[PDB]
Amino acid sequence: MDIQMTQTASSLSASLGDRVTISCRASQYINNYLNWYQQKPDGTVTLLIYYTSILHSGVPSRFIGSGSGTDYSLTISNLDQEDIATYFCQQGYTLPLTFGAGTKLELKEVKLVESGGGLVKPGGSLKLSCAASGFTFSTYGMSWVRQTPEKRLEWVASISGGGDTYYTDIVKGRVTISRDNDRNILYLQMSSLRSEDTAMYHCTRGALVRLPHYYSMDYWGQGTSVTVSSL
Protein backbone atom coordinates (compact mmCIF):
# COMPACT_ATOMS: atom_id res chain seq x y z
CA MET A 1 0.00 0.00 0.00
CA ASP A 2 0.98 3.64 -0.44
CA ILE A 3 3.26 5.24 2.15
CA GLN A 4 1.43 8.04 3.97
CA MET A 5 3.55 10.98 5.14
CA THR A 6 2.17 12.79 8.19
CA GLN A 7 3.17 16.29 9.26
CA THR A 8 1.10 16.60 12.42
CA ALA A 9 1.32 20.40 12.62
CA SER A 10 0.14 22.57 9.74
CA SER A 11 1.80 25.74 11.07
CA LEU A 12 4.26 26.63 13.82
CA SER A 13 4.62 30.09 15.36
CA ALA A 14 8.01 31.43 16.40
CA SER A 15 10.11 34.57 16.78
CA LEU A 16 13.16 35.66 14.82
CA GLY A 17 16.27 33.81 15.93
CA ASP A 18 14.27 30.96 17.47
CA ARG A 19 14.96 27.27 16.90
CA VAL A 20 12.04 25.25 15.54
CA THR A 21 11.69 21.58 14.61
CA ILE A 22 9.15 20.34 12.05
CA SER A 23 8.14 16.70 12.43
CA CYS A 24 7.38 14.25 9.62
CA ARG A 25 6.21 10.66 10.09
CA ALA A 26 6.08 7.88 7.50
CA SER A 27 3.45 5.15 7.72
CA GLN A 28 6.20 2.57 7.15
CA TYR A 29 9.96 2.15 6.81
CA ILE A 30 11.51 4.32 4.08
CA ASN A 31 15.24 3.65 4.64
CA ASN A 32 16.06 7.33 5.30
CA TYR A 33 14.95 8.17 1.72
CA LEU A 34 13.38 11.42 2.92
CA ASN A 35 13.43 14.77 1.11
CA TRP A 36 12.46 18.23 2.36
CA TYR A 37 11.12 21.03 0.16
CA GLN A 38 10.58 24.73 0.85
CA GLN A 39 7.74 26.77 -0.66
CA LYS A 40 8.02 30.54 -0.27
CA PRO A 41 4.84 32.61 0.19
CA ASP A 42 4.83 33.49 -3.52
CA GLY A 43 4.68 29.76 -4.35
CA THR A 44 8.29 29.13 -5.41
CA VAL A 45 9.34 25.58 -4.48
CA THR A 46 12.97 24.59 -3.96
CA LEU A 47 14.68 21.45 -2.73
CA LEU A 48 15.98 21.99 0.81
CA ILE A 49 17.35 18.65 2.06
CA TYR A 50 17.65 15.17 0.57
CA TYR A 51 18.62 11.77 2.00
CA THR A 52 17.31 12.88 5.42
CA SER A 53 20.23 15.22 6.13
CA ILE A 54 22.21 16.28 3.02
CA LEU A 55 21.78 19.97 2.23
CA HIS A 56 20.87 21.12 -1.25
CA SER A 57 23.32 23.59 -2.77
CA GLY A 58 22.53 27.10 -1.60
CA VAL A 59 20.86 25.92 1.63
CA PRO A 60 22.70 27.15 4.75
CA SER A 61 23.70 24.90 7.64
CA ARG A 62 20.99 26.55 9.76
CA PHE A 63 18.80 23.72 8.41
CA ILE A 64 19.41 20.33 10.05
CA GLY A 65 17.59 17.24 8.80
CA SER A 66 17.48 14.17 11.01
CA GLY A 67 15.57 11.01 11.80
CA SER A 68 15.38 7.33 10.90
CA GLY A 69 12.85 4.55 10.52
CA THR A 70 9.48 6.31 10.42
CA ASP A 71 10.17 9.50 12.42
CA TYR A 72 11.99 12.41 10.76
CA SER A 73 12.49 16.07 11.58
CA LEU A 74 13.71 19.37 10.16
CA THR A 75 15.35 21.71 12.69
CA ILE A 76 15.85 25.36 11.72
CA SER A 77 18.04 27.40 14.07
CA ASN A 78 18.28 31.20 14.24
CA LEU A 79 15.04 31.66 12.33
CA ASP A 80 15.32 34.35 9.66
CA GLN A 81 12.78 36.30 7.61
CA GLU A 82 13.75 34.20 4.58
CA ASP A 83 12.66 31.04 6.45
CA ILE A 84 8.98 32.09 6.63
CA ALA A 85 7.66 29.46 4.22
CA THR A 86 5.92 26.09 4.01
CA TYR A 87 8.01 22.93 4.38
CA PHE A 88 7.04 19.58 2.83
CA CYS A 89 8.57 16.17 3.44
CA GLN A 90 8.56 13.46 0.78
CA GLN A 91 9.49 9.79 0.77
CA GLY A 92 11.36 8.50 -2.27
CA TYR A 93 11.61 4.91 -1.07
CA THR A 94 8.80 3.41 -3.17
CA LEU A 95 6.21 4.40 -5.74
CA PRO A 96 4.02 6.31 -5.61
CA LEU A 97 6.17 9.15 -4.32
CA THR A 98 4.17 10.78 -1.54
CA PHE A 99 4.37 14.13 0.24
CA GLY A 100 3.41 15.39 3.65
CA ALA A 101 0.70 18.03 3.82
CA GLY A 102 3.17 20.78 4.73
CA THR A 103 4.00 22.80 7.85
CA LYS A 104 4.06 26.59 7.70
CA LEU A 105 6.41 28.75 9.74
CA GLU A 106 4.88 32.00 10.97
CA LEU A 107 6.25 34.91 12.99
CA LYS A 108 4.56 35.85 16.25
CA GLU A 109 21.25 28.34 -13.75
CA VAL A 110 18.78 25.48 -14.19
CA LYS A 111 15.59 26.84 -15.77
CA LEU A 112 12.15 25.20 -15.93
CA VAL A 113 9.21 27.07 -17.48
CA GLU A 114 5.76 25.48 -17.79
CA SER A 115 2.93 26.40 -20.15
CA GLY A 116 -0.25 24.95 -21.61
CA GLY A 117 -2.52 25.19 -18.58
CA GLY A 118 -6.01 26.58 -18.82
CA LEU A 119 -9.70 26.12 -18.06
CA VAL A 120 -11.68 23.10 -19.27
CA LYS A 121 -14.87 21.34 -18.35
CA PRO A 122 -14.93 17.74 -17.10
CA GLY A 123 -14.00 15.43 -19.95
CA GLY A 124 -11.82 18.11 -21.53
CA SER A 125 -8.17 17.86 -22.50
CA LEU A 126 -4.99 19.92 -22.29
CA LYS A 127 -1.30 19.50 -23.11
CA LEU A 128 1.28 20.96 -20.73
CA SER A 129 4.79 21.88 -21.86
CA CYS A 130 7.97 22.29 -19.81
CA ALA A 131 10.91 24.04 -21.49
CA ALA A 132 14.22 23.13 -19.85
CA SER A 133 17.58 24.87 -20.14
CA GLY A 134 20.80 25.30 -18.21
CA PHE A 135 21.58 21.57 -18.04
CA THR A 136 21.83 18.40 -20.12
CA PHE A 137 18.10 17.71 -20.29
CA SER A 138 18.56 14.33 -21.98
CA THR A 139 20.51 12.71 -19.10
CA TYR A 140 18.05 13.63 -16.32
CA GLY A 141 14.82 12.09 -15.17
CA MET A 142 11.91 14.51 -15.08
CA SER A 143 8.62 14.55 -13.19
CA TRP A 144 5.29 16.34 -13.04
CA VAL A 145 4.08 17.31 -9.56
CA ARG A 146 0.79 19.10 -8.93
CA GLN A 147 -0.33 21.26 -6.00
CA THR A 148 -4.07 21.14 -5.31
CA PRO A 149 -6.13 24.17 -4.21
CA GLU A 150 -5.79 22.67 -0.71
CA LYS A 151 -1.99 23.15 -1.06
CA ARG A 152 -1.26 19.40 -1.17
CA LEU A 153 1.63 18.18 -3.32
CA GLU A 154 0.81 15.11 -5.42
CA TRP A 155 3.30 13.30 -7.64
CA VAL A 156 1.74 12.76 -11.07
CA ALA A 157 4.30 11.07 -13.29
CA SER A 158 8.01 10.57 -13.92
CA ILE A 159 10.03 9.78 -17.03
CA SER A 160 13.59 8.50 -17.27
CA GLY A 161 16.15 10.00 -19.62
CA GLY A 162 15.60 7.05 -21.95
CA GLY A 163 11.81 7.38 -21.90
CA ASP A 164 10.51 4.90 -19.32
CA THR A 165 7.30 6.20 -17.76
CA TYR A 166 5.79 5.88 -14.28
CA TYR A 167 2.45 7.26 -13.09
CA THR A 168 0.51 7.57 -9.87
CA ASP A 169 -2.51 5.28 -9.89
CA ILE A 170 -5.26 7.91 -10.03
CA VAL A 171 -3.96 9.44 -13.28
CA LYS A 172 -3.01 6.21 -15.09
CA GLY A 173 -4.68 6.07 -18.49
CA ARG A 174 -5.72 9.74 -18.29
CA VAL A 175 -2.34 11.51 -18.64
CA THR A 176 0.77 10.76 -20.69
CA ILE A 177 4.26 12.00 -19.84
CA SER A 178 6.73 12.32 -22.71
CA ARG A 179 9.91 14.17 -23.63
CA ASP A 180 11.66 15.65 -26.67
CA ASN A 181 15.37 15.43 -25.89
CA ASP A 182 16.40 17.45 -28.96
CA ARG A 183 14.25 20.50 -28.12
CA ASN A 184 14.56 19.93 -24.34
CA ILE A 185 10.82 19.92 -23.65
CA LEU A 186 8.84 17.86 -21.15
CA TYR A 187 5.19 17.16 -21.97
CA LEU A 188 2.05 16.04 -20.15
CA GLN A 189 -0.98 15.35 -22.35
CA MET A 190 -4.11 15.25 -20.19
CA SER A 191 -7.44 13.75 -21.22
CA SER A 192 -10.86 13.10 -19.66
CA LEU A 193 -10.06 15.67 -16.99
CA ARG A 194 -11.97 15.56 -13.71
CA SER A 195 -12.67 18.33 -11.21
CA GLU A 196 -10.11 16.84 -8.80
CA ASP A 197 -7.38 17.34 -11.43
CA THR A 198 -7.58 21.09 -10.75
CA ALA A 199 -4.12 22.09 -9.53
CA MET A 200 -0.95 23.98 -10.32
CA TYR A 201 1.26 21.61 -12.32
CA HIS A 202 5.03 21.81 -11.83
CA CYS A 203 7.72 20.07 -13.86
CA THR A 204 10.68 18.98 -11.75
CA ARG A 205 14.17 17.67 -12.46
CA GLY A 206 15.13 14.35 -10.91
CA ALA A 207 18.65 14.15 -9.50
CA LEU A 208 19.94 10.65 -8.80
CA VAL A 209 20.72 10.21 -5.08
CA ARG A 210 21.17 6.46 -4.63
CA LEU A 211 20.84 3.50 -6.97
CA PRO A 212 18.60 2.22 -8.30
CA HIS A 213 15.51 4.44 -7.95
CA TYR A 214 16.09 7.06 -5.23
CA TYR A 215 15.81 10.59 -6.62
CA SER A 216 15.38 14.09 -5.30
CA MET A 217 13.50 16.81 -7.19
CA ASP A 218 16.28 19.38 -7.06
CA TYR A 219 14.72 22.05 -9.31
CA TRP A 220 11.11 23.14 -9.78
CA GLY A 221 9.40 25.33 -12.34
CA GLN A 222 6.94 28.05 -11.39
CA GLY A 223 4.06 25.86 -12.58
CA THR A 224 1.09 26.22 -14.92
CA SER A 225 -2.49 26.23 -13.68
CA VAL A 226 -5.16 23.71 -14.67
CA THR A 227 -8.80 24.38 -13.75
CA VAL A 228 -11.48 21.74 -14.39
CA SER A 229 -14.99 22.96 -13.55
CA SER A 230 -18.50 22.38 -14.84
CA LEU A 231 -19.09 26.15 -14.77
Q: What angle do CA 99, 3, 128 make, to 5 degrees?
A: 45
In this structure, how many other beta carbons lie within 10 angstroms of the beta carbon of residue 32? Answer: 18
Which residues on neighbouring strands pair with residue 215, listed in sequence order? Answer: 208
Degrees to nearest 5, angle at CA 186 with 181 and 190: 140
What is the 3 state secondary structure string of the chain? Answer: CCCCEECCCCEEEECCCCCEEEEEEECCCCCCCEEEEEECCCCCEEEEEECCCEECCCCCCCEEEEEECCEEEEEECCCCHHHCCEEEEEECCCCCCEECCCEEEEECCCEEEEECCEEECCCCCEEEEEEEECCCHHHCEEEEEEECCCCCEEEEEEECCCCCEEECHHHCCCEEEEEECCCCEEEEEECCCCHHHCEEEEEEEEEEEECCCEEEEEEECCCEEEEECCC
Experimental method: X-ray
